[PDB]
């Protein structure tokens, strides 16, 4: 069995609550999924070809498992699951965006803020 619910979020800048331009690289809302007693935040990365690396952590800086659910090369998107727990209010992220053709190379250190804490699901 699986249960899911949408969850709104905003990626915000390191050291403040200001929106990050990284927020534009992810589709909204995301989704919370509970399957085999485990919880995930499922999210769709825009311009997936630009994402050279991504890492997610909880608010205590522990590493969170990510898995690729879907790669849509035609749309240039990638759908991932990020392991979470009920009660999580944010994820710390470390993301490397690269577009070599324009010599664009940027490292984001941001915090993805859920609109509400990850819920317990039945």
Domains of the chain (ranges, CATH numbers): 1-122 (2.60.40.1850)
Q: Tell me: is residue 104 an annotated ligand-binding position.
A: yes
φ, ψ for residue 85 (rounded to 5)? Answer: -130, 150
Asked whether residue 13 is marked as a ligand-binding residue, the answer is yes
- The DSSP secondary structure of the chain, one letter per residue, reads -EEEEEE-EEEEETTSSSBPGGGGGB-SSEEEEEETTEEEEEEEESSGGGEEEEEEE-TT--B--EEEEEEETTTTEEEEEEEE-TT--EEEEEEEEEEGGGTEEEEEEEEEEESSPPPP--
The method recorded for this entry reads: X-ray
């Amino acid at each position: 069995q699986a249960t899911s619910q949408p969850i709104n979020f905003q990626v915000q800048k390191d050291g403040s609550s200001e929106k990050s331009h990284m927020d534009d690289y992810m589709q909204h809302p995301g989704k919370v999924i509970k399957q085999n007693n485990k919880y995930y935040f499922q999210t769709v990365l825009n311009n997936a070809s630009f994402w050279k690396e991504y890492k997610f952590y909880n608010a205590n800086n522990q590493e969170l498992a990510t898995t690729v659910v879907n790669d849509n090369k035609k749309a240039d998107t990638r759908t991932i699951n990020v392991a979470v727990e009920p009660g999580y209010k944010s994820l710390t992220t470390k993301v490397h965006i690269v577009v070599p053709q324009i010599n664009y190379n940027h490292r984001y250190t941001t915090h993805l803020e859920f609109e509400k804490a990850i819920p317990t699901l039945a």
